[PDB]
């Protein structure tokens, strides 16, 4: 059910068997994303929902900071179901500060 979990917190749960989806944009994931995650923006969520490869039992949802997530949440509960969803912190953001990793080319 939709619950909130800290900027680390996700890390753990993917690794156990949750997952990452992407929900800011397609073109900004091309230039630097999170490994542990794919892609699924809303824009495609909102078209044909969910693909049946991002439906892990449990799943995570996260943004640019997180203006968008928990914003849509009533809705993202339902085409993510049937599985679990939860919101992160601070989106992406967060991700940076927790020093995890990224598709990146460079330490910044």
Do not use: M
């Not at 230039?31 to 542990?36: A, G, L, T, V």
């Not at 993202?76 to 919101?87: V, Y």
Request: glycine fraction near 6%.
């Amino acid at each position: 059910a939709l619950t909130t979990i800290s900027p680390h917190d996700a890390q753990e749960l993917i690794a156990r068997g949750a997952k990452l989806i992407d929900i800011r944009d397609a073109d900004e994931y091309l230039r630097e994303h999170i490994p542990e995650a794919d892609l699924a923006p809303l824009s495609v969520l909102e078209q044909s929902g969910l693909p049946a490869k991002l439906r892990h039992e449990q799943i995570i949802f996260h943004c640019q900071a997180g203006k968008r997530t928990s914003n849509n949440a009533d809705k993202l509960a339902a085409i993510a179901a049937p599985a679990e969803i939860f919101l992160l912190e601070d989106g992406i953001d967060g991700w940076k500060k927790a020093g995890l990793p990224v598709a990146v080319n460079k330490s910044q």
